[PDB]
Design a protein around this ligand. Structure first.
Ligand SMILES: *[C@@H]1O[C@H](CO)[C@@H](O)[C@H](O)[C@H]1NC(C)=O
Lengths: 49, 36
């Protein structure tokens, strides 16, 4: 009474419908202008004028 | 490791005031000759 076990598991079966099909979710997070950016795409740098 | 110092003596939590302490550059953004 007034006591529940919070830890639970997601039921995963390959025959379940699309509602129960697990989707791996990778949330992409970033910081803007808070530091020099060390991650930048392969965009070739140019000369300075 | 867990060995206590013998001659060590406790002291009450005395307090001390600071003057300019706590002032720093907020971040990598630079400013000069201005008041922000
Ligand atoms: C020192 O002695 C106290 C009281 O017996 C003990 O709780 C503690 O674990 C010992 N070790 C240190 C260095 O605090």
């Amino acid at each position: 009474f007034n006591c529940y076990f919070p830890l639970q598991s997601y039921g995963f079966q390959p025959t379940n419908g699309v509602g129960y099909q697990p989707y791996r979710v990778v949330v992409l997070s970033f910081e803007l202008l808070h530091a020099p950016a060390t991650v930048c795409g392969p965009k070739k740098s140019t000369n300075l004028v | 490791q867990c060995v206590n110092l013998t001659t060590r003596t406790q002291l009450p939590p005395a307090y001390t005031n600071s003057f300019t302490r706590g002032v720093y550059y907020p971040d990598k953004v630079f400013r000069s000759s201005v008041l922000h």
